[PDB]
Structure 1
Amino acid sequence: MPLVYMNIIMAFAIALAGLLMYRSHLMSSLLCLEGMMLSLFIMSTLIILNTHFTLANMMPIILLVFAACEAALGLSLLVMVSNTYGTDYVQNLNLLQC
């Protein structure tokens, strides 16, 4: 497992950590999720191309399509939250509590 895979895994870990921080701005949360899926796409594509496994050339396309659909769903949810409160601030979602 060479250094390029380690760099991409580090990028995925950085994106996950940035998602789990939540300074503010749920839009940044969606951006971190999309960075994670982009890292997944890159690293899976490298694995598939390196080993000449012909039939998994489909899989990155499927992953991209599904993750972009999830992105659209999250964008719609963010828009509804913003229309409810006037902003996409994370701290405004405190109505439900443990």
Structure 2
Amino acid sequence: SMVYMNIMMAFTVSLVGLLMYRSHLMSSLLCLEGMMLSLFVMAALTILNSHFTLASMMPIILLVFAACEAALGLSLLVMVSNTYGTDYVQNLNLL
């Protein structure tokens, strides 16, 4: 309507952020929590304006799962450095 357009514009920048890769792999895991942050604000405004009360529980569940993927991806980042030296998008073997 008005406030939604700004946070949708913040989503599009973070969308590019997940599709852009430069040197380190750490940027993606910031953008994974970044994109979930933008979705959380969008969920909070939609539910509260046209009141739900029952469905206001749903973004709290979403916020739990927001870091569920982020914790697993950040733990995968650990094992790549052990096999190599430093985590790099530039450094990959598979074809």
Q: TM-score interval w.r.t. the shorter chain? A: over 0.9
The list of structure 1 runs, each at least 4 consecutive aligned residues, that deviate by more than 4 angstroms after superposition, is none
Amino acid at match of 2:32: L
Following TM superposition, by how much is the alpha carbon of 1:83 offset from its aligned partner in structure 2, in angstroms? 1.5
Q: Distance in 1 between matches of 2:18 and 2:9?
A: 14
Following TM superposition, by how much is the alpha carbon of 1:24 offset from its aligned partner in structure 2, in angstroms? 2.2
Q: Distance in 2 between matches of 1:37 and 1:76?
A: 18
Match of 1:60 in 2: 59
Match of 1:96 in 2: 94
* Higher helix proportion (structure 1 or 2): 1
User: How large is the Cα RMSD of the aligned pairs?
Assistant: 1.0
Following TM superposition, by how much is the alpha carbon of 1:18 offset from its aligned partner in structure 2, in angstroms? 1.3
Instruction: List gaps (5 residues or longer) in structure 2.
Output: none
The number of residues matched between the two structures is: 95
Q: Distance in 2 between matches of 1:8 and 1:36?
A: 11
Instruction: List gaps (5 residues or longer) in structure 1.
Output: none
Amino acid at match of 2:93: L
TM-score, normalisation: structure 2 = 0.94
TM-score, normalisation: structure 1 = 0.91
